[PDB]
Design a protein around this ligand. Sequence first.
Ligand SMILES: Nc1nc2c(ncn2[C@@H]2O[C@H](COP(=O)(O)OP(=O)(O)O)[C@@H](O)[C@H]2O)c(=O)[nH]1
Ligand SMILES: [Mg+2]
Length: 384
Amino acid sequence: TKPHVNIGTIGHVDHGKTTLTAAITKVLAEKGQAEFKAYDQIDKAPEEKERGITISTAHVEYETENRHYAHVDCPGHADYVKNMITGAAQMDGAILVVSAADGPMPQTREHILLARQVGVPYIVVFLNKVDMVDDEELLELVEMEVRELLSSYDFPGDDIPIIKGSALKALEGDEEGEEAIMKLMDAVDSYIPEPERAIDKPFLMPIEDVFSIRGTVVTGRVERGIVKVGEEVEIVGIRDTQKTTCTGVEMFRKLLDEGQAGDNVGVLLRGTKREDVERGQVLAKPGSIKPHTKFKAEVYILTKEEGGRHTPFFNGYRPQFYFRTTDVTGVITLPEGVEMVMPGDNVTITVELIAPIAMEEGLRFAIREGGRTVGAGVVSEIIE
Ligand SMILES: Nc1nc2c(ncn2[C@@H]2O[C@H](COP(=O)(O)OP(=O)(O)O)[C@@H](O)[C@H]2O)c(=O)[nH]1
Ligand SMILES: [Mg+2]
C-alpha cells in the first residue's frame, strides 16, 4: 500500500549518522510505525561479502504515515564508497548528517561528490549536535557553508531542507529532539521523490545470446520498460545502430505478447541477420539510448584482499571494461593532478573504448584484467 523508498545516512565519521538512524526508528516506533533498533544494534553492522568485496552495512526499515523506507547506514567511509559505486545499496535519496559544532569535514565533501557521481537524486540534511552550539549566529553560518558545499557540486543548496536538532537528545526522550526527528521525516516524505518504476522507463534489454533457427532470436533479461509484439526496436551499439520490429517474445514452452522489466525472454527480430547481432549490444526503444566510446566515470579499485591488483596503475592503463555482457578494451586517463591509483582508492577517470557501447550516465560496469575483476565503476559523464 505505502510506496517504497530507499535512503541512507551519509556524512563524516562521528557526526552522528548511526545515532540519528537509531533515533528515527525510536521516534517512529513510538508512533506505531517501526520496530526500535538501539544504537549498538546498528553500530555493529554485519559484514556482507558480495563478489570478493566485503562491505559492512546496517539495514533498518520503518514507515511514516505516507511511505515505507529502507535505510542503510555504514560504519566506515570505505563502506560508503563501495556501496555507492557498486550499487549494493541504491539510494533514491540521502540524509546528510553534519555536526553543527565541527561543520563540514573531508568525508562530508567526498560523500556529496560521490552522491553526484553515482546519481543520488536528492539530498536532505540533518544538522546535528545543536546542543553543543549556544550561538544562533554560529548555527546559521555553518548551515550557510553546507548549502554552498552542496551547490558547489550542483545540488540545489538553496532549496534543500536542512533540519537542526540533536539526535542524542531525541534518543533520550527529549521533546525538542523528537520534534526535530519528525521535521526531518516530514522533509524526507516531501522532498525526496518516489523512484520511477522500471516498467515505465524506455525499453532496454541487454543481448546475451543470438540464435538463428523463424529467423534471428536474441535472449536476455529485459532491464526496463516493455517490448510488445509488433513494436520497433533499435540494436545498439558496437556497430552502426539499426532498426527492426519485434515479431515474437517467448520463454520455455510459452509464447508471449510482451516482455517487461525483469523477464528472461527470447525476442524474435524481423529480417535481422544473425551475423549483424552479437552479445554486448542491447535492444532498446528507438532514440532512447546512443552508442559511445568515451566517457568519465567514478571507479573503486579493489584491494588485494578483495581479489584485485596489488600494485598501482598509471596514466594510460589499458584494461577491459565489462558492460552488461562482454568486455571492451579501453584506455584510462587520470585527473589533472592525479599520478597513480592505489588498490582500494576511488577516483574519477576518463576512458576511451576501442568499440562503441550503448551508454548513459548511471550505467555501471566492471574493470577486468586477465579475466579478473579489478575495479567497479559508474558512468558519470558522456563525452562525444
Ligand atoms: N552531544 C551530542 N553528541 C552526539 C549527538 N549525536 C551523536 N553524538 C555522539 O557522537 C559520537 C559518534 O556518533 P555516531 O552516531 O556513532 O557517529 P557516526 O560515525 O556518524 O555513526 C557518539 O559518542 C555519540 O554519542 C548529538 O546530537 N549531540
Ligand atoms: Mg556510524
